[PDB]
Design a protein around this nucleic acid. Structure first.
Ligand SMILES: [K+]
Ligand SMILES: [K+]
Ligand SMILES: [K+]
Ligand SMILES: [K+]
Ligand SMILES: [K+]
Ligand SMILES: [Mg+2]
Ligand SMILES: [Mg+2]
Ligand SMILES: [Mg+2]
Ligand SMILES: [Mg+2]
Ligand SMILES: [Mg+2]
Ligand SMILES: [Mg+2]
Ligand SMILES: [Mg+2]
Ligand SMILES: [Mg+2]
Ligand SMILES: [Mg+2]
Ligand SMILES: [Mg+2]
Ligand SMILES: [Mg+2]
Ligand SMILES: [Mg+2]
Ligand SMILES: [Mg+2]
Ligand SMILES: [Mg+2]
Ligand SMILES: [Mg+2]
Ligand SMILES: [Mg+2]
Ligand SMILES: [Mg+2]
Ligand SMILES: [Mg+2]
Ligand SMILES: [Mg+2]
Ligand SMILES: [Mg+2]
Ligand SMILES: [Mg+2]
Ligand SMILES: [Mg+2]
Ligand SMILES: [Mg+2]
Ligand SMILES: [Mg+2]
Ligand SMILES: [Mg+2]
Ligand SMILES: [Mg+2]
Ligand SMILES: [Mg+2]
Ligand SMILES: [Mg+2]
Ligand SMILES: [Mg+2]
Ligand SMILES: [Mg+2]
Ligand SMILES: [Mg+2]
Ligand SMILES: [Mg+2]
Ligand SMILES: [Mg+2]
Ligand SMILES: [Mg+2]
Ligand SMILES: [Mg+2]
Ligand SMILES: [Mg+2]
Ligand SMILES: [Mg+2]
Ligand SMILES: [Mg+2]
Ligand SMILES: [Mg+2]
Ligand SMILES: [Mg+2]
Ligand SMILES: [Mg+2]
Lengths: 317, 46, 44
RNA sequence: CAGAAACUAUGUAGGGUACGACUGUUCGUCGAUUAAAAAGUUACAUGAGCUGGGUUAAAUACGUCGUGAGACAGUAUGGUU
RNA sequence: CGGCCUCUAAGUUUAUAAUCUGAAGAUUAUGACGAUGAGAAAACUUUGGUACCAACAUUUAAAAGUGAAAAUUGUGCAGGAAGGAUAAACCGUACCUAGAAUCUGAAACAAGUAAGCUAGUAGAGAAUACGAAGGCGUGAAUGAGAUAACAAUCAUAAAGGAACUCGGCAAACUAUACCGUAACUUAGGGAUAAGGAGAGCAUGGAAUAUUGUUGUACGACUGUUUAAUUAAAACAAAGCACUUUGCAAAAAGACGAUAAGUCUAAGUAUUGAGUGUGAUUUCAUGUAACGAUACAACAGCUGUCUCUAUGAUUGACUCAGUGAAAUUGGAA
RNA sequence: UCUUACUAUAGUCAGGACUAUAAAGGUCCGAACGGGUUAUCGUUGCAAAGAUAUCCGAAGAACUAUGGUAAGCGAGUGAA
């Protein structure tokens, strides 16, 4: 009996600690990922000095960036206006996204596009976006424009993109949008999801609800319950790479492949270029601890129902 | 002390930095030309 | 490099794509694959 | 002052007064030999003769003092003679 | 057989349009321009794994081997350009490649500089040794003598073996497909542990080839750092912790005589930024591993020393040639 | 045209050993290459940073080439 080189426990992969730089390397297990190259006409190269943290002036505006692996951007559809059934061809890995993407194919025309894959989605699954309205067959089967019960059963499936209004309360969505005709902005990262708290509805006394407001309340991944539009899009599911945050890089060289450069502490500097060298503050004088809020005061959140719960520096565990 | 800062120097970088077209075509390079021209310089650039 | 660097650059000094003619006149046009088509209306 | 050894003092500087351990150093301390293992002056006698144990730095950590920049006859490692 | 020429990347733009702006100018889009890249044929010629041409590995011009080229297949994650297409003009061609007259270092400088090839023997090898061709053994910018002291670079050494010294500084020792291998341990290691061994004085030169072992302090580790006196205990580091960021037109942060605007990001709370800590274990501290770090012990080793001697070369010295410098109030 | 960071396009790393792989490792010994640990010499030097030996890394956070961007009221770049 000999232990294998690859040691699989949980959903995280570990290796034999035959080097000090591979002992603490932990990877999530995703074997279903497409082992080939992405759909080229849906990608473009990410190069230039912006990869090095430089803006149009040429000066460093984002620190600790540059020197990473060559990459390409994946054009991912966060609007999903086109209707009809789409067949998932393969779940792929995107360097620039924590979550996984799915190369869907429109059965009507055959055009392919990328979408943030849900947790559990595999090839062959048929997804559909009801953001552009309901088709005639589905609309005709019920016999009414909106029935709060039958509609959810036929359309509230994992990977389906619907307006938040059509989704029942308590459903987990992962591509929550903000504007009535805007792309998904919230909960797009791996493992993130949002529950639907309530809807501005009224009772007809027949047991059928009907929309009366213009918004809906949803709890975001940060715990903030905020007012979202009624026509805001939302995909039913959770982002594919749930265990992303359980990974470990193991060595300093893997952070350099991810386009991350060394972070020099303020204490390790001289007093000429940091307040600390020679209360916690950034190199430019922004308090780094003490609860100071960097949101602009004159910018009030008119969509906040229940704000985030501040931890106030207390330790969690 | 002085360093060998011109070892491996190419004459293509000499024309792109201190050439005549690098100066007539810029607001700050037209001053250098006129100054060297008003002084009597034969070698206005490169 | 002290002094020769300051002389006027010629084609017999550098090779990295530096071209300079002798005012021999244009006798044709350049093709897209690097050849030359002699226009005998310009030939004298 | 019986002898021997030792004590005190008077002449006398010819030649000697070594070796090692531990102590940053001379201060010193000890080991075992030895007739004995005494001192001082000479710009520390002597670095245009050597060393760098020193004579001064910039690095780093710790300690103490100061609101702070810093300071210290502090401590440790390193540092073109 | 390169350039010119066509195409474009990073980028540039006193090009045009719009927009912002005390002037200068700046921003965005388009155009133009821009190789270090891509460009039909020729021993005669004119869609996206049904993929792609990053790294690595494998296979393939059929007598065998080797090295390319291109392609085939596959592996790992760190997920790997753009665009165009597809009857012979003009310019380069000499010499020099740094140990012998040419590049950069103020110069005829013991330094530095890109690519291909670079006999053979012997090897695992581009190691080490010899050297076929070739070049060289400097432009008197030197040559011939002599072989003191002393210096530099070396060789050997009786007995002793660190007694030297701030300190083992320097030098010396250290030596094949074998049987057997401990505490400890993050279970990978420790480990090539250790311990047993491979005709004449010698199966013989060179290189491989270096003090070894053990235990402490500090830092987990590989790395980075004051170009040219400090390479480390310092910086970074993976991991961990905290604060902040909901993106509805500006997410926060950074930048903008100052804005439009740009990076963040074609990202979205498992995102981004900032801050401290510095793997793991126990919650500052204890181990495995690692160190041109600092220190101690033990064994060996030796000219470090008792205590120096001798030998070698190059200077020093003499003759011929060439010919400096700091310095100097005046000097019996 | 030095140098620091980034950027685009390219190149380079004999041989052997171990490890789960034919290829998965900031693995091991060691040339090229890159460093500059210790000592000696040199100090009007061969050299305004060199010579000799010794030592370190050598598939990577590696090294190298040709261009590009960012510097001087503010501070560019900075594993500091
Ligand atoms: K950061
Ligand atoms: K840090
Ligand atoms: K300091
Ligand atoms: K202006
Ligand atoms: K090595
Ligand atoms: Mg960090
Ligand atoms: Mg400092
Ligand atoms: Mg300088
Ligand atoms: Mg250069
Ligand atoms: Mg020439
Ligand atoms: Mg030339
Ligand atoms: Mg050209
Ligand atoms: Mg008596
Ligand atoms: Mg006498
Ligand atoms: Mg004395
Ligand atoms: Mg004297
Ligand atoms: Mg200091
Ligand atoms: Mg302190
Ligand atoms: Mg040292
Ligand atoms: Mg030609
Ligand atoms: Mg062009
Ligand atoms: Mg070219
Ligand atoms: Mg030379
Ligand atoms: Mg040479
Ligand atoms: Mg020269
Ligand atoms: Mg020659
Ligand atoms: Mg001769
Ligand atoms: Mg002897
Ligand atoms: Mg003997
Ligand atoms: Mg002694
Ligand atoms: Mg002693
Ligand atoms: Mg030694
Ligand atoms: Mg360390
Ligand atoms: Mg230094
Ligand atoms: Mg040094
Ligand atoms: Mg910890
Ligand atoms: Mg903003
Ligand atoms: Mg710390
Ligand atoms: Mg610590
Ligand atoms: Mg190291
Ligand atoms: Mg003479
Ligand atoms: Mg440069
Ligand atoms: Mg290695
Ligand atoms: Mg090593
Ligand atoms: Mg260095
Ligand atoms: Mg001297």
């Amino acid at each position: 009996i000999v232990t294998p080189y690859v040691r699989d426990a949980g959903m995280m992969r570990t290796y034999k600690p035959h080097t000090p730089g591979i002992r603490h390397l932990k990877r999530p297990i995703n074997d279903h990922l497409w082992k080939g190259r992405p759909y080229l006409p849906l990608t473009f190269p990410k190069k230039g000095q912006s990869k090095g943290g430089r803006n149009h002036s040429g000066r460093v505006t984002v620190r600790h960036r540059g020197g990473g692996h060559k990459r390409r951007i994946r054009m991912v559809d966060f609007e999903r206006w086109i209707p009809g059934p789409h067949t998932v061809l393969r779940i792929e890995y995107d360097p620039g996204r924590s979550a996984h993407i799915a190369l869907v194919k429109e059965e009507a025309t055959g055009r392919k596009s990328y979408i943030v894959a849900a947790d559990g989605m595999r090839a062959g699954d048929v997804v559909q976006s009801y953001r552009s309205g309901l088709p005639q067959d589905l609309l005709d089967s019920m016999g009414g424009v909106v029935d709060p019960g039958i509609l959810a059963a036929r359309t509230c499936w994992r990977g389906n993109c619907l307006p938040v209004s059509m989704i029942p309360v308590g459903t987990q969505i992962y591509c929550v949008g903000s504007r009535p005709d805007g792309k998904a902005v919230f909960c797009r990262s791996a493992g993130t999801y949002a529950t639907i708290i309530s809807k501005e509805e009224e009772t007809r006394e027949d047991g059928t609800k009907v929309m009366t407001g213009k918004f809906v309340n949803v709890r975001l991944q940060s715990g903030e319950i905020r007012r979202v539009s009624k026509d805001a899009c939302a995909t039913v599911g959770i982002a594919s790479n749930i265990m992303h945050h359980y990974r470990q890089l193991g060595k300093a060289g893997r952070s350099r492949w991810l386009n991350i450069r060394p972070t020099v502490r303020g204490l390790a500097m001289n007093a000429n270029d940091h307040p600390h060298g020679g209360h916690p503050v950034s190199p430019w004088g922004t308090p780094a601890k003490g609860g100071y809020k960097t949101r602009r005061k004159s910018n009030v959140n008119k969509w906040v129902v229940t704000p985030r719960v501040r931890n106030m520096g207390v330790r969690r565990n | 002390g002085p360093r060998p800062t011109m070892s491996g120097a190419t004459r293509l970088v000499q024309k792109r930095r201190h050439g005549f077209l690098s100066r007539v075509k810029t607001k700050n390079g037209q001053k250098t030309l006129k100054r060297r021209l008003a002084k009597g310089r034969l070698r206005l650039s490169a | 490099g002290l002094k020769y660097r300051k002389l006027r650059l010629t084609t017999k000094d550098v090779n990295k794509g530096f071209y300079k003619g002798n005012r021999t006149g244009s006798m044709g046009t350049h093709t897209s694959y690097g050849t030359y088509k002699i226009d005998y209306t310009k030939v004298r």
